[PDB]
């Protein structure tokens, strides 16, 4: 009764052949005649100084002004990016915080890491002081990423190879997303919030149905860990960043890889990815000192953000599209346009 | 698994 | 004994095989159309005037 082992290989071939049948022309062939973007030369407009050690994560508030960052110094800082002043500095229990998130409402932030817990902080208490409103316990491995759906719902990814949807009020996992065979490193919610994508150390990305808890599609191609993942702004595609020194673009409806973004002299891993507002530019952070701005349609490197003295660990583009934030192991965030 | 997290955090041991 | 591993793999593969796909040429055309339709609204692609840029430097003339 290991016709199941044959059957698995039959189905893998059918999927491969179905994908191949849809591969009639490449994205590059299709975008060959459009004008290139030209030289993108963004400048550092603001530097956020205040962290005492490596920055590990950041996330913009939906107002395109406030952002939260997490650091080895054991602080979560909420920054006013326009003035460079801090708004809040939240002391954490440990240094080893790997992710932070800003709720779309602006009412809460979240973070976690080697504690294996997603902590939720109320920014708008009656007292006027920030304090822990919930500690989401359940993962049996490190918290790698988290993103609020709303004030009562957050999605987490973990080194335990699962993702989960949480009801914050009850503190319970409402849905558990099982399927990955390696540490899950990053997640990105679809614009409409019905779907999300995860990237993991099994070198695959998975599309999940949020309500029904099922993996709908699995995307392969990367040769090593996927560390970063981000939806294209219309929700029909997403980009990944990997230890294999490439970013890749995957399409949901064609169910396959559309493009690789790479260069012969890039040997190090990608830590973070994000699209510009229109999706035309793909920005990626690297283990060396820089961020590369890629033409997402043509795969040309349009530019470089060179202003850190160590790893660019994280980045994000504002909802209004006005600026990119980079966070680094050199202990600074920088705001670029 | 801890090894990936140590690389991400910049720890050695 | 643990052939329920192989059953679960098959059930997941069935779900992945049971989708209708579009041609890459069509998918690529829709992405390009999106980018062209929103190119003017992207500040990092098409620079807004320096007075509309929220990270402009403040000026105190006086």
């Amino acid at each position: 009764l290991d016709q199941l082992r044959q059957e698995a290989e039959q189905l893998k071939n059918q999927i491969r052949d179905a994908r191949k049948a849809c591969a009639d022309a490449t994205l590059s062939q299709i975008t060959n005649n459009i004008d290139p973007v030209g030289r993108i030369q963004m400048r550092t407009r603001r530097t956020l100084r205040g962290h005492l050690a490596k920055i590990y994560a950041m996330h913009w508030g939906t107002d395109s002004r406030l952002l939260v960052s997490a650091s080895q110094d054991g602080k979560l800082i909420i920054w006013d990016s326009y003035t460079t002043n801090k708004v809040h500095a939240i002391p954490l229990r440990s240094s080893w915080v790997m992710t932070c998130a800003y709720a779309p409402s602006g009412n809460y932030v979240a973070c976690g890491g080697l504690d294996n817990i997603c902590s939720i902080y109320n920014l708008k208490t009656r007292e006027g002081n920030v304090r822990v409103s919930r500690e989401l316990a359940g993962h049996t491995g490190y918290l790698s990423c988290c993103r609020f759906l709303d004030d009562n719902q957050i999605v987490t990814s973990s080194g335990d190879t699962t993702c989960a949807l949480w009801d914050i009020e009850t503190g319970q996992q409402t849905t558990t997303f099982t399927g990955h065979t390696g540490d899950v490193m990053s997640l990105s919610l679809a614009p409409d919030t019905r779907l999300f994508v995860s990237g993991a150390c099994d070198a695959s990305a998975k599309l999940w149905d949020v309500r029904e808890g099922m993996c709908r599609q699995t995307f392969t191609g990367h040769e090593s860990d996927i560390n970063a993942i981000c939806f294209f702004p219309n929700g029909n595609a997403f980009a990944t960043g990997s230890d294999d020194a490439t970013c890749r673009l995957f399409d949901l409806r064609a169910d396959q890889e559309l493009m690789t973004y790479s260069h012969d002299n890039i040997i190090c891993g990608i830590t973070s990815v994000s699209f510009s507002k229109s999706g035309r530019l793909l920005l990626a952070g690297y283990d060396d000192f820089n961020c590369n701005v890629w033409d997402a349609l043509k795969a040309d490197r349009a530019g470089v953000l060179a202003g850190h003295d160590n790893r660019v660990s994280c980045l994000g583009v504002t909802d209004d599209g006005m600026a990119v934030a980079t966070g680094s192991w050199d202990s600074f965030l920088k705001i670029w346009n | 698994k801890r090894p990936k997290a140590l690389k991400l955090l910049g720890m050695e041991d | 004994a643990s052939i329920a591993q192989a059953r679960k793999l098959v059930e997941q593969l069935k779900m992945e095989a049971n989708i209708d796909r579009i041609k890459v040429s069509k998918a690529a055309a829709d992405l390009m159309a999106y980018c062209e339709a929103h190119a003017k609204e992207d500040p990092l692609l098409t620079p807004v005037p320096a007075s509309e840029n929220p990270f402009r430097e403040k000026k105190f003339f006086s």
Side-chain angles (χ1 to χ4, degrees):
Chain A
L1 186 37
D2 276 41
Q3 297 142 308
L4 297 178
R5 188 168 282 133
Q6 263 94 334
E7 189 175 9
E9 288 293 303
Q10 310 321 317
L11 293 162
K12 282 183 189 188
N13 288 340
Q14 175 176 25
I15 292 160
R16 186 178 46 73
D17 296 344
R19 288 167 173 178
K20 192 173 289 196
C22 289
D24 56 346
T26 67
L27 176 57
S28 45
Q29 286 167 343
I30 296 284
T31 66
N32 196 48
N33 301 354
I34 76 187
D35 298 330
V37 299
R39 249 189 245 288
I40 301 301
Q41 269 153 197
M42 304 184 209
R43 284 188 158 285
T44 298
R45 307 300 184 184
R46 304 285 190 282
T47 305
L48 307 178
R49 311 167 180 281
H51 282 299
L52 309 174
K54 293 184 184 65
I55 294 156
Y56 292 134
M58 69 79 54
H59 197 226
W60 282 106
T62 56
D63 73 353
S64 298
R65 173 163 185 176
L66 303 178
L67 70 91
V68 59
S69 62
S71 169
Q72 180 183 6
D73 68 11
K75 299 282 167 66
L76 218 60
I77 301 174
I78 291 84
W79 300 93
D80 183 344
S81 71
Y82 288 15
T83 66
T84 78
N85 298 342
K86 67 168 165 68
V87 183
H88 299 292
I90 301 155
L92 306 176
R93 293 201 205 276
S94 75
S95 287
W96 314 123
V97 56
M98 298 173 69
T99 175
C100 60
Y102 218 134
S105 71
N107 297 328
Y108 300 88
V109 294
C111 71
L114 290 184
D115 58 7
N116 303 1
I117 284 153
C118 184
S119 287
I120 312 302
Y121 293 84
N122 195 342
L123 305 182
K124 310 287 185 59
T125 62
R126 288 296 317 286
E127 281 59 42
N129 50 53
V130 179
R131 43 171 197 74
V132 185
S133 61
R134 219 81 178 77
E135 294 186 348
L136 304 173
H139 282 297
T140 60
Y142 63 86
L143 199 88
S144 64
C145 191
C146 65
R147 289 289 178 266
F148 289 93
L149 275 61
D150 52 66
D151 280 3
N152 197 38
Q153 289 190 102
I154 188 161
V155 176
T156 57
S157 59
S158 174
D160 74 13
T161 83
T162 69
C163 301
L165 177 67
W166 302 77
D167 182 301
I168 294 169
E169 195 175 71
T170 69
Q172 302 300 305
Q173 294 195 354
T174 61
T175 305
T176 304
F177 306 97
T178 62
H180 281 294
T181 60
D183 300 18
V184 191
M185 303 317 299
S186 190
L187 66 94
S188 183
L189 301 177
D192 69 0
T193 226
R194 301 188 175 83
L195 307 170
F196 84 92
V197 290
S198 56
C201 292
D202 60 23
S204 77
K206 288 181 175 289
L207 178 71
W208 306 88
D209 190 293
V210 170
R211 298 199 189 78
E212 302 180 13
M214 59 184 52
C215 175
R216 291 199 181 284
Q217 294 171 246
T218 299
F219 299 87
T220 50
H222 281 293
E223 296 194 303
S224 57
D225 304 350
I226 294 170
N227 304 313
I229 199 165
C230 192
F231 261 101
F232 189 85
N234 76 357
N236 289 344
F238 66 89
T240 49
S242 169
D243 283 343
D244 74 8
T246 73
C247 300
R248 289 166 203 249
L249 178 67
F250 292 94
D251 194 82
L252 273 54
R253 297 175 300 155
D255 186 40
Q256 58 195 286
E257 183 186 313
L258 297 197
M259 196 109 80
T260 297
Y261 310 91
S262 67
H263 188 248
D264 295 336
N265 299 348
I266 292 166
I267 60 166
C268 70
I270 288 74
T271 62
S272 48
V273 289
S274 186
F275 284 101
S276 67
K277 194 173 176 68
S278 68
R280 183 59 188 277
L281 303 174
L282 176 63
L283 296 90
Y286 292 80
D287 295 343
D288 61 31
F289 312 110
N290 300 321
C291 294
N292 290 323
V293 182
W294 296 98
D295 187 334
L297 295 177
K298 302 181 77 63
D300 304 316
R301 192 175 75 188
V304 180
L305 318 178
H308 284 289
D309 294 334
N310 213 312
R311 179 168 301 194
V312 179
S313 55
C314 52
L315 61 75
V317 177
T318 54
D319 282 350
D320 71 9
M322 288 296 336
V324 196
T326 55
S328 171
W329 280 8
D330 71 10
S331 85
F332 299 110
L333 300 107
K334 293 193 163 180
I335 310 304
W336 308 75
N337 64 24
Chain B
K1 254 56 178 174
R2 290 268 295 199
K4 181 62 180 188
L6 298 198
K7 288 199 299 196
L8 231 62
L9 295 164
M11 295 176 71
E12 290 289 347
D13 288 304
Chain C
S2 71
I3 69 102
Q5 179 72 357
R7 197 98 67 193
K8 191 78 80 63
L9 175 62
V10 166
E11 299 311 322
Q12 180 54 34
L13 284 164
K14 281 176 178 184
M15 187 153 235
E16 294 176 11
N18 178 36
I19 63 183
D20 298 307
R21 300 179 180 76
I22 65 170
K23 296 165 194 289
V24 174
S25 65
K26 194 202 177 301
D30 291 336
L31 293 177
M32 192 192 295
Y34 190 85
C35 290
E36 291 180 4
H38 295 89
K40 282 67 171 169
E41 303 162 39
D42 190 338
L44 301 175
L45 197 61
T46 61
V48 306
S51 58
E52 280 170 32
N53 184 344
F55 301 92
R56 67 191 175 282
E57 304 304 322
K58 295 192 179 186
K59 299 202 165 192
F60 307 85
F61 299 103
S62 178

